[PDB]
Design a protein around this nucleic acid. Structure first.
Ligand SMILES: [Zn+2]
Ligand SMILES: [Zn+2]
Lengths: 134, 57, 179, 49, 65, 106, 286, 69, 44, 57, 443, 196
RNA sequence: AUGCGA
C-alpha cells in the first residue's frame, strides 16, 4: 500500500512515559485534549488556566480567550467509555502506533480532561441613551 | 384625482341584428363582433320566477 | 494601411482597418471545396475559423493607437477596444485562440499600468493616500487577477505566442509598485 | 335555525315547501343528481349533470 | 457491543444477528468472525415507556394546574 | 488556581483516531503512519491491516486548517504536562468480505 | 396559503395585493427588499466557526436536538452547546457588522434557532446562496446597516422606531417603517389613515390608471396605450415619490374637490365633474 | 404635456405665467409661494395649476425624429 | 375512451363541464339586447 | 378615482354655473359625495384634502 | 419645507438629461433582482451559471454498436460527446446575408418592427471519439436567444441617460423584460421552498402514498451550483422503515434510506447508529426504531456485505433509466446516480458530507415523529426563497442543451440502425449528422 | 371627526387600563396567581405550552378577546356623542350613521374612538413559532397590542405594528368576500333545477 | 384557459 503519491514513511517518533510515573489508580496522571485554532502559537505558552475548571478564560497576545472544558462527550456520568476518540500511542520512530491502555486489558482509555480554546468577543452592549432618542 | 383606463362607458354595446354561429344560428359573442349579451341560466330562472313565460319564450 | 501610416495627413489605417473588418467579417465557416483561384491568400478571408489578418492588425494598431500619449470623458479608446473585442467573445475569433486572447490581455495589462501610474509615483501620487483607504488598489488587484486569467486561458488552449516567464515577472515587479 | 343564526328572516312557506319536495318519496331525497334520477322529466335530467 | 436491544459486531461494528435467535450456542459476525457472548452473555432488556402524549383526556387536563 | 505548562513537544509522535463505537482491534493491531510535506505543513494518513479487515484513516483537511489539536499528560504533583501535537484521523475498517463484486452488468 | 403571515414583515407588502382570485397568491415585494444574485465567502466560514469553538463534524461524531448543529449552506460543519450556539450567532453578527473579516459577507444570513420545548428544531443555519430575500435593518450595537433575511428574522427583535426600543430586547431597529411597504403602498399619502381594503383597492386603481406610459411613444408600437396629456405632481406625496422619480410619469392631477352631497347625481359610487373644467381639458386623455 | 392655458377651476388664463414663473424661481432665487403671489395667482385653483405642473414636453422634445442626432 | 389533448367527441361537445345543453340551450345569446355601465339620475 | 381607492364614475358634466361657488370665487373641479366615507373610512382622503389646500395656499 | 418640490431640478433634468448616471438609483435597483440574475448566466464565478450547467451535464456516450468483428462486445469504439462552453452575443443583424457589414441592433428597432430581440446563442460542441482517440470541436450557432434588456448582454446595459435618449429610449429604461415578437414580456418571480435546508413537514399526501406511510417526512430542495434543484424526501413508515423519495425524468422512485447510507460511504452499522442517536443512546423510542431499520435492511439484502455491492445493486436497478448503458458498469451508474440525486447541494466528492447530512435528516425526522420538535411550515416566508426569472431561464437552457445532445445521440442511433455508413472520425459525418438535427434552441 | 379635549381625556384614560388586561388574561388562561410578574419563568413555559396547542390558544384568544372587547365597549360607551367635538344636529358623520344614511355606530367608533381588536377566522392574530406576532414583539408579549389589539383610531392613525394587523383583517375579509359567491352559486342551482 | 372591470 504505502499509498498517496504524496506521503513519506515515518522516521522520527518519541517515547511516551505512559508508566514511568503511572501506578494503577495511584498516580492521578491525566491526558488532556485541547483544540487550538491555528492562530495561536502553542509553543509560546507558559501555563494553562485549565485549573479554572470552568472559568478557564484566558488572554493570549492581549487577545481574550475562553478555554472550554467539557465533561460531555467523554466524561459523562452515564456510560462506560462513550468515546471513539481513540488514542494511538507510538513507541519508536521505526514502529507503528499503539492502542492506548493502562495494562494489558485490551481496553481503550479516556482523556482525564478535555479542553477547547474559543476566542471570545466583546460584542459591546448598546448605549440605549444614545440610540433611543424620542 | 386620476382617470382610470377602464372607460367601460366606451365599452357599451347594442345588437339588434348580427352574425350567428354556424352550428346554432345564435348571436356571436363580443363587442367587436356585434355579438349579443348572454341570457345565462340564472336570468332564465329569474324570468320563470316572474311568471313571465311569454317574456321567457 | 501603410500608405495611411506614411500619409502623415488624413486617416488612421485604423478607420480603413475597421472599415475592412466590417467589409470582411464573413463569419462563415467553410474553406476547401471549390478551386480557390482568385481568392487564395490568407490575407483576405475568414470569420468561421481562418483568422483574418487585417482584423488582427486592426486590434494591434488600435492598442498602439491607445498607448501614444496616455500616461506620458473624451478618452474611452482603451475601453472602446475592451468592448469591441468583447462583442466577439468566441465565434471565429476567440473561438479560435491566441492573439485574440493575448492582445486582449495586453490591452488589459496596459489598462492596469496606467492605473498604477495614476496612483503610483511616490506612493500613488505622493505622501500616502489617506484618501479613503485605497479603493483604487482594489480596482487594480481585481484587474491584475483577471488579466492573469486571460493570459492563462490563452496558454492552456494551445497558444504558443506568449513568453509567460517575462510577463509574470513584469506583473509581479509592477504589483510591487502598487505596494 | 341556519338562517336564524345569521338573523335572516325567511318565510316558512319557502322552507316548508322545500322540505316537502325533499320528502316527495317518503325519504330524505337530496337535490343532487341522485335524487333527480327518479323524477320523470328526462330532459331535466339531461340538462343538469 | 450491545446497545439497548442492538448488539454490534465488536470487530466490524455490524449489527450482528441477535444472540437470542442464533441456531447455535454461538454468534458470528457476517462482516467479522467473532463468536457470540462466549466471553460474556447479554440479557437484553429495554424499559420502554409511553410518550406521555397519545392519551389526551380531561384528567390529563386536571394534571396541568 | 491555574495549571502551569512544563514542556511542549512539537514533533509528530502520538496520534488520535475516530472509530466505530466499540473498536478494540487485535491486541497487536498495527497502525501505519504516513507523512505529507505540503507547502509548509504535513498531512497524515493512517493505515492498518488485520486477519480479516484493514483500517485506513485520514485528516479532515478543512478542519485541520481551521483547528489544531494538542494533547498533554499532566501530573498534579509535578504540575507538569508533556504536550503533544496529534492529528485526529477518522479511520474506517474494511474486511476481506468487503472486497467482492458482481459482473460489470446484469 | 393566502393567510397573511407575520413572517412577511419587511418582505412582502401587506397592502399590495390584488382583489379577487389572486388575493394572497400575488404577493408583492417590499420596496426595500433585495434578492441575492451571487454567493460568496462560504470558504472561510469553517475556519472562523472552528475558531469560535465548533467541533468538526468528524470529531464530535454525536448528534441531537440536545445540541446545536452548525451548518453553512446546508453543509453540516460541526456541533456545539446551545449556549455556545447563541454566543456564536451573536459574535458572528458582530464580525458581520464589522469590516475586518473578509471571509464574512455583510449579506450572510445567520440562522440561529434556539432550543425550544417542542419548538423548531434547534441549529445554527447560515446561508449565503442565491435567491435569498434580504432586507436592510439598522444594527444598534454598531449603529450600522445589517442585512436580515426572513429565516433569521423570526428570532430577531427588531424595534420599529428608536423610541420604542425595549431595554435588552430589540437588537435592531427599522431604518424607516416605510421599508415594510411596497412601492405603490408608499405612494399613497397617509396610507395609515384608511381602512386597509381601501388601500389595496388603491393599489389596484393606481395600477389601473390612465397616465403617462412613457415619452418614447413615437418609437413604440403598442397594441394600446393610454396617455394622459394633463399630468401633474401631487401636492401630497411620499418622499419616495421623488426617490423613485415617479414624477417623470405623472399619472393624475390635483383637482379642487368639494366633499358635498348637493346635486343628487352623486350617490354610492358616482361623482360629478365640472363642465367648464372638462371643456378645459380636465383629465383629457388619448 | 404642456402648461395648460387656463385654470380648470377658475378660468383665468395661466399659460402666460409659466416662463416668467420659472424665471422667478431662477433669477430672483425666490420661493414658489412668493413667485405665485407676484404673478397674481391669488386663488388656489390658479395656484395649484402652475405649482403642480409637470412640463413633460421638454422630455418629449428630445425624441423628435425629424432631425439627425 | 380512446388511446395529447385529442379533439373532443360528441360526448365532450355535449357536456364536458356544462355542455351544449347548458351553454347553448339553457341560455343563449339574444338579439335586441344591449349592455352598458349604468349612471344614476334622480329626475327620471 | 383618488389615491384612496374610492373609485366612481362621472355621472354628469355639471354646468359650471350650476356648480356651487365658494366665497373665494371658485366652483369645484370634482364633487364627491360625503356619504361614501362612513363605510369606507378613507379619512386619509379628508386629510389629503386639507393638506392639498394648505399646500396650494 | 419638508417634502418641497424638486422643480428646478426636474426642469434641468428634463431639458438636459444626465450624461453620466441616472438619478433615482432605487429605480434601477428595484429591477436589480431581475437584471443581476440574468447577468449570472454570463458572468460570475467560473463562467457564469450557464457554463457551470453545461459542465455538469457532462457527456452523452454512444457506441456504433460494437462493431469490428471482443471487437463487438468491448464496444466498436467510444464516441464521447459534450458541450464545453456557451457564449451569448449582443443582438446583431446582417442583411443580404454574408457581405452586409453588421450593425448593432437596438431595442427600438425590435419594437417598431414588431419582432423579437434575439441574441445569437453559440455553444462550443465537443465531439470526443474513442474517449479521446480523436477530439473534434465545433461551435455551432443555435439560433437567436431572447436577451434581457439592460442585462450584461444588451447594448443598453451601460449607456448613460444621455446616450440612452440618443437611442430613442425612455431616459430611465429599467429593462429586465424581454421583447419577443415585439411584445414586452418579463418572467414572473416565483416563491419556492428555501433551498438546501431540511424542512419538517406533516402532509396527508404522504399517507396517500400507500400502506405503512406516516404523515411525517423531511423535504430538502437541493439546488446545484447551476441552480437546478432536486427535491429529496424521507418518509417514516408506520413500520419504522425509512424510504427516500426523489424524482427522475419526472417519475418518482422510492429507495430505503439505509441503502443510500451504505451506498454513500463505506461504513459500519454502528457508524450509522452513532451518526443518528449519538450520545442519546437512552431513547428506547429511537433505539428501537433504529433497530427496526437496521435489522430490516439486513433482512432484505443479506448479501450486500459491502458498499461496492450496494452501488452495484443501484446501478443494476437504474441503468435502464439513466441511459448510460453501452458504456457504464453498474458501479459507475451507481456512483453517478448518487452524485446526481442525493443531496446534490453538497456536490461531487461530498459523499461523506452527504452522509452527515443524510443522518441529520433521519434524526430530525425521528424528532418530528416522536413530537419532540414542531413541524415546519411550507407556506411561511421563513421557509421560502424566490426563483428569479433569469435562473428559470438558465434551467430551461440547461435542459434544452441536454435535449440537443440527446438529439445528436438519437440521430447517430438512427443512422447506425439504417446504414452505419460512416465512422465517427470523418468530419463530413460530423457535418452531416449535425446538419440533420434541429439546433435552433433560440426559437 | 374630532373629540373634545374631554373626549380625548376619557378615551386615553380608559385605554390606560388595558395594559394590565393583556397579561391579566394571559395569567387567567394560564391559571396562575394575580399580578403574576410578566417575567415569571413559569409564565413563559406555560405560555409556550399554550402556543403549541391550537385549542388552548383558542381559549387564550377568547378570554383576552372578551376582556379587551370589554375595553372597547367601555371606550365607545363613554366617548360617543358624549365626547364628539360637535353633536348630532350638526355632526354629519353621526347623522349618517345614526340616521342610517350610510355607516354604522361601529364605523363611527372606529374613526372617532379606536379600531379595537382585529380578529382572524374567529380568533386573535396569528403567531410565529418563535412566540412573536411581529418582529418588534418579544416572544409571548402579554400586551394586548402585540396580540393584535389596535388602540389607534383612523382619525389619529395607527402604529405600523397595528397597520400590519389591520392589513390582516382586511385581507381575510377580501378572501371570504371574494370566495363565498362561488360556493353559493351551486347552492342556488342545485335546487333551482329541481323546483322550477 | 392568463390577467383584469363589475
Ligand atoms: Zn464483523
Ligand atoms: Zn385658477
Amino acid at each position: 500500500f504505502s499509498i498517496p503519491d504524496g506521503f513519506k514513511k515515518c522516521k522520527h517518533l518519541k517515547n511516551f512515559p505512559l508508566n514511568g510515573d503511572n501506578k494503577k489508580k495511584a498516580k492521578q496522571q491525566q491526558v488532556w485534549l485541547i483544540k487550538f485554532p491555528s492562530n495561536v502559537d502553542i509553543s509560546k505558552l507558559k501555563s494553562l488556566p485549565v485549573d479554572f475548571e470552568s472559568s478557564t478564560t484566558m488572554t493570549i497576545d492581549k487577545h481574550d480567550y475562553k478555554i472550554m472544558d467539557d465533561t460531555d462527550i467523554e466524561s459523562s456520568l452515564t456510560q462506560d467509555n462513550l468515546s471513539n476518540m481513540t488514542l494511538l500511542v507510538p513507541s519508536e520512530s521505526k514502529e507503528s502506533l499503539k492502542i492506548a491502555s493502562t495494562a494489558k486489558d485490551n481496553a481503550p482509555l479516556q482523556f482525564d480532561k478535555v479542553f477547547s480554546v474559543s476566542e471570545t468577543a466583546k460584542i459591546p452592549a448598546i448605549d440605549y441613551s444614545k440610540v433611543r432618542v424620542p | 384625482y386620476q382617470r382610470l383606463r377602464h372607460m367601460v362607458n366606451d365599452k357599451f354595446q347594442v345588437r339588434s341584428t348580427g352574425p350567428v354561429n354556424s352550428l346554432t344560428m345564435q348571436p356571436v359573442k363580443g363587442r367587436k363582433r356585434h355579438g349579443g349579451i348572454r341570457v345565462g341560466e340564472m336570468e332564465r330562472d329569474a324570468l320563470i320566477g316572474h311568471g313571465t313565460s311569454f317574456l321567457l319564450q | 494601411v501603410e500608405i495611411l501610416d506614411n500619409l502623415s495627413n488624413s486617416s488612421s489605417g485604423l478607420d480603413f482597418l475597421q472599415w475592412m473588418c466590417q467589409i470582411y467579417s464573413s463569419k462563415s465557416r467553410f474553406v476547401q471545396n471549390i478551386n480557390y483561384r482568385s481568392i487564395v491568400p490568407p490575407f483576405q478571408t475568414g470569420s468561421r475559423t481562418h483568422t483574418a489578418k487585417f482584423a488582427i492588425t486592426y486590434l494591434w494598431s488600435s492598442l498602439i493607437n491607445c498607448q501614444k500619449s496616455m500616461e506620458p470623458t473624451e478618452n474611452d479608446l482603451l475601453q472602446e477596444l475592451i468592448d469591441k473585442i468583447s462583442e466577439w467573445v468566441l465565434t471565429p475569433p476567440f473561438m479560435e485562440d491566441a492573439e485574440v486572447w493575448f492582445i486582449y490581455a495586453s490591452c488589459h495589462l496596459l489598462k492596469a499600468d496606467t492605473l498604477s501610474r495614476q496612483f503610483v509615483n511616490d506612493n500613488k501620487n505622493n505622501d500616502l493616500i489617506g484618501l479613503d483607504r485605497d479603493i483604487k488598489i482594489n480596482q487594480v488587484i481585481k484587474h491584475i487577477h483577471y488579466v492573469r486569467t486571460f493570459l492563462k486561458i490563452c496558454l492552456d488552449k494551445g497558444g504558443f505566442a506568449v513568453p509567460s516567464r517575462l510577463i509574470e515577472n513584469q506583473l509581479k515587479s509592477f504589483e510591487s509598485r502598487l505596494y | 335555525n341556519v338562517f336564524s343564526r345569521y338573523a335572516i328572516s325567511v318565510s316558512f312557506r319557502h322552507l316548508d315547501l322545500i322540505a316537502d319536495m325533499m320528502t316527495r318519496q317518503g325519504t330524505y331525497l337530496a337535490f343532487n343528481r341522485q335524487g333527480m334520477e327518479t323524477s320523470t322529466s328526462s330532459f331535466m335530467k339531461m340538462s343538469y349533470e | 457491543s450491545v446497545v439497548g436491544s442492538l448488539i454490534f459486531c465488536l470487530d466490524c461494528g455490524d449489527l450482528l444477528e441477535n444472540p437470542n435467535a442464533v441456531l447455535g450456542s454461538n454468534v458470528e459476525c457476517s462482516q467479522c468472525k467473532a463468536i457470540y457472548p462466549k466471553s460474556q452473555f447479554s440479557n437484553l432488556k429495554v424499559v420502554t415507556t409511553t410518550a406521555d402524549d397519545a392519551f389526551p383526556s380531561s384528567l390529563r387536563a386536571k394534571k396541568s394546574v | 488556581s491555574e495549571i502551569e505548562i512544563e514542556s511542549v513537544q512539537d514533533q509528530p509522535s502520538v496520534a488520535v483516531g475516530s472509530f466505530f463505537k466499540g473498536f478494540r482491534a487485535p491486541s497487536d493491531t498495527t497502525f501505519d503512519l504516513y507523512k505529507k510535506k505540503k507547502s509548509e505543513k504535513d498531512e497524515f494518513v493512517l493505515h492498518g491491516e488485520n486477519e480479516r479487515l484493514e483500517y485506513e484513516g485520514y485528516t479532515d483537511s478543512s478542519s485541520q486548517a481551521s483547528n489544531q489539536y494538542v494533547v498533554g499528560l499532566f501530573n498534579p504533583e509535578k504540575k507538569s504536562i508533556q504536550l503533544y501535537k496529534a492529528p485526529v484521523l477518522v479511520s474506517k475498517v474494511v474486511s476481506k468480505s468487503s472486497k467482492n463484486l458482481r459482473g460489470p452488468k446484469i | 396559503v393566502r393567510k397573511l403571515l407575520p413572517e412577511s414583515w419587511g418582505f412582502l407588502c401587506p397592502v399590495h395585493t390584488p382583489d379577487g382570485s389572486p388575493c394572497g397568491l400575488l404577493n408583492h415585494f417590499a420596496h426595500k427588499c433585495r434578492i441575492s444574485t451571487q454567493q460568496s465567502d462560504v470558504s472561510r466560514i469553517p475556519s472562523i466557526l472552528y475558531s469560535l469553538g465548533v467541533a468538526p463534524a468528524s470529531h464530535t461524531f454525536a448528534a441531537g436536538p440536545s445540541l446545536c448543529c452548525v451548518q453553512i449552506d446546508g453543509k453540516i460543519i460541526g456541533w456545539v452547546s446551545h449556549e455556545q450556539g447563541k454566543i456564536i450567532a451573536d459574535t458572528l453578527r458582530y464580525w458581520k457588522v464589522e469590516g475586518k473579516t473578509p471571509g464574512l459577507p455583510i449579506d450572510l444570513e445567520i440562522g440561529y434557532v434556539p432550543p425550544s420545548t417542542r419548538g423548531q428544531y434547534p441549529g445554527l443555519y447560515l446561508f449565503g446562496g442565491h435567491s435569498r430575500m434580504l432586507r436592510p435593518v439598522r444594527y444598534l450595537p454598531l449603529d450600522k446597516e445589517d442585512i436580515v433575511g426572513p429565516f433569521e428574522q423570526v428570532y430577531m427583535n427588531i424595534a420599529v422606531t428608536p423610541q420604542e426600543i425595549q431595554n435588552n430586547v430589540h437588537t435592531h431597529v427599522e431604518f424607516t417603517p416605510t421599508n415594510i411597504l411596497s412601492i405603490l403602498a408608499n405612494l399613497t399619502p397617509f396610507s395609515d389613515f384608511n381602512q386597509s381594503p381601501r388601500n389595496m383597492y388603491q393599489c389596484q386603481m393606481g395600477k389601473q390608471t390612465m397616465g403617462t406610459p412613457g415619452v418614447a411613444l413615437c418609437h413604440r408600437s403598442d397594441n394600446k396605450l393610454y396617455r394622459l396629456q394633463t399630468g401633474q405632481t401631487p401636492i401630497v406625496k411620499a418622499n419616495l415619490y421623488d426617490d423613485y422619480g415617479m414624477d417623470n410619469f405623472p399619472n393624475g392631477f390635483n383637482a379642487v374637490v368639494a366633499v358635498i352631497s348637493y346635486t343628487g347625481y352623486d350617490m354610492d359610487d358616482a361623482m360629478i365633474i365640472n363642465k367648464s373644467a372638462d371643456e378645459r381639458g380636465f383629465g383629457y386623455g388619448t | 404635456m404642456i402648461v395648460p392655458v387656463r385654470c380648470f377651476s377658475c378660468g383665468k388664463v395661466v399659460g402666460d405665467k409659466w416662463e416668467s414663473y420659472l424665471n422667478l424661481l431662477q433669477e430672483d432665487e425666490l420661493d414658489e409661494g412668493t413667485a405665485l403671489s407676484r404673478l397674481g395667482l391669488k386663488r388656489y385653483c390658479c395656484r395649484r395649476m402652475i405649482l403642480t405642473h409637470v412640463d413633460l414636453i421638454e422630455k418629449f422634445l428630445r425624441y423628435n425624429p425629424l432631425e439627425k442626432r | 375512451k380512446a388511446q395529447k389533448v385529442p379533439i373532443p367527441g360528441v360526448k365532450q361537445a355535449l357536456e364536458k363541464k356544462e355542455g351544449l345543453f347548458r351553454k347553448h340551450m339553457m341560455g343563449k345569446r339574444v338579439n335586441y339586447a344591449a349592455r352598458s355601465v349604468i349612471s344614476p339620475d334622480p329626475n327620471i | 378615482s383618488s389615491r384612496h381607492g374610492q373609485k366612481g364614475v362621472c355621472s354628469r358634466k355639471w354646468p359650471t354655473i350650476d356648480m356651487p361657488f365658494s366665497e373665494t370665487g371658485i366652483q369645484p373641479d370634482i364633487i364627491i359625495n360625503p356619504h361614501a366615507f362612513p363605510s369606507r373610512m378613507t379619512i386619509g382622503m379628508f386629510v389629503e384634502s386639507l393638506a392639498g389646500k394648505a399646500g396650494a395656499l | 419645507r419638508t417634502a418641497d418640490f424638486r422643480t428646478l431640478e426636474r426642469e434641468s433634468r428634463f431639458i438636459n438629461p444626465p450624461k453620466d448616471k441616472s438619478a433615482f438609483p432605487l429605480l434601477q435597483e428595484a429591477v436589480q433582482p431581475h437584471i443581476g440574475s440574468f447577468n449570472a448566466l454570463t458572468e460570475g464565478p467560473d463562467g457564469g451559471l450557464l457554463n457551470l450547467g453545461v459542465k455538469d451535464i457532462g457527456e452523452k456516450v454512444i457506441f456504433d454498436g460494437k462493431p469490428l468483428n471482443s471487437n463487438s462486445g468491448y464496444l466498436g469504439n467510444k464516441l464521447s460527446v459534450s458541450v464545453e462552453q456557451v457564449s451569448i452575443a449582443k443582438p446583431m443583424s446582417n442583411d443580404g446575408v454574408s457581405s452586409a457589414v453588421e450593425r448593432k441592433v437596438y431595442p427600438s428597432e425590435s419594437r417598431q418592427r414588431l419582432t423579437s430581440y434575439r441574441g445569437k446563442l453559440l455553444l462550443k460542441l465537443k465531439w470526443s471519439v474513442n474517449n479521446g482517440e480523436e477530439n473534434l470541436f465545433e461551435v455551432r450557432d443555435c439560433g437567436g436567444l431572447p436577451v434581457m434588456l439592460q442585462s450584461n448582454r444588451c447594448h443598453l446595459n451601460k449607456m448613460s441617460p444621455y446616450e440612452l435618449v440618443q437611442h430613442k429610449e425612455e431616459s430611465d429604461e429599467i429593462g429586465g423584460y424581454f421583447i419577443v415578437n415585439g411584445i414586452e414580456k418579463l418572467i414572473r418571480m416565483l416563491i419556492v421552498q428555501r433551498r438546501n435546508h431540511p424542512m419538517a413537514i406533516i402532509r396527508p399526501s404522504f399517507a396517500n402514498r400507500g400502506a405503512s406511510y406516516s404523515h411525517y417526512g423531511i423535504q430538502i430542495r437541493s439546488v446545484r451550483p447551476d441552480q437546478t434543484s432536486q427535491t429529496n424526501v424521507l418518509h417514516y413508515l408506520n413500520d419504522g422503515q425509512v424510504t427516500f423519495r426523489f424524482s427522475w425524468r419526472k417519475n418518482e422512485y422510492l429507495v430505503p434510506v439505509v441503502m443510500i447510507l451504505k451506498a454513500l460511504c463505506h461504513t459500519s452499522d454502528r457508524e450509522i447508529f452513532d451518526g443518528i442517536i449519538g450520545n442519546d443512546v437512552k431513547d428506547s423510542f429511537l433505539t428501537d426504531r433504529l433497530e427496526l431499520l437496521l435489522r430490516g435492511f439486513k433482512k432484505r439484502y443479506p448479501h450486500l456485505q459491502n458498499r461496492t455491492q450496494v452501488l452495484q445493486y443501484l446501478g443494476d436497478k437504474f441503468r435502464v433509466v439513466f441511459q448510460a448503458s453501452p458504456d457504464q458498469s453498474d458501479l459507475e451508474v451507481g456512483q453517478e446516480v448518487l452524485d446526481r440525486i442525493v443531496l446534490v447541494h453538497l456536490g461531487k466528492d461530498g459523499s461523506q458530507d452527504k452522509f452527515r447530512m443524510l443522518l441529520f435528516m433521519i434524526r430530525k425526522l425521528y424528532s418530528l415523529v416522536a413530537g419532540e420538535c414542531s413541524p415546519d411550515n411550507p407556506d411561511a416566508t421563513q421557509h421560502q426563497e424566490v426563483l428569479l426569472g433569469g435562473f428559470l431561464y438558465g434551467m430551461i437552457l440547461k435542459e434544452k442543451i441536454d435535449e440537443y445532445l440527446q438529439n445528436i445521440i438519437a440521430q447517430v442511433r438512427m443512422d447506425i440502425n439504417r446504414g452505419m455508413a460512416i465512422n465517427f472520425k470523418d468530419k463530413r459525418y460530423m457535418s452531416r449528422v449535425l446538419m440533420r438535427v434541429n439546433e435552433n434552441i433560440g426559437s | 371627526l374630532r373629540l373634545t379635549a374631554e373626549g380625548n381625556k376619557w378615551r386615553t384614560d380608559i385605554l390606560k387600563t388595558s395594559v394590565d388586561t393583556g397579561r391579566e388574561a394571559a395569567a387567567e388562561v394560564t391559571n396562575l396567581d394575580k399580578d403574576t410578574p410578566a417575567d415569571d419563568p413559569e409564565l413563559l413555559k406555560r405560555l409556550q405550552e399554550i402556543l403549541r396547542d391550537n385549542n388552548k390558544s383558542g381559549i387564550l384568544d377568547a378570554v383576552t378577546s372578551s376582556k379587551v372587547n370589554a375595553i372597547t365597549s367601555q371606550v365607545v360607551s363613554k366617548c360617543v356623542p358624549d365626547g364628539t367635538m360637535k353633536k348630532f344636529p350638526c355632526n354629519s358623520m353621526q347623522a349618517m350613521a345614526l340616521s342610517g344614511a350610510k355607516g354604522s355606530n361601529v364605523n363611527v367608533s372606529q374613526i372617532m374612538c379606536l379600531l379595537g381588536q382585529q380578529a382572524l377566522e374567529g380568533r386573535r392574530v396569528p403567531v410565529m413559532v418563535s412566540g412573536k406576532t411581529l418582529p418588534s414583539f418579544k416572544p409571548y408579549e402579554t400586551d394586548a397590542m402585540a396580540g393584535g389589539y389596535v388602540k389607534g383610531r383612523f382619525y389619529s392613525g395607527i402604529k405600523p405594528q397595528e397597520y400590519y394587523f389591520h392589513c390582516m383583517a382586511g385581507r381575510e375579509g377580501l378572501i371570504d368576500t371574494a370566495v363565498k359567491t362561488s360556493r353559493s352559486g351551486y347552492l342556488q342551482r342545485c335546487l333551482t333545477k329541481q323546483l322550477e
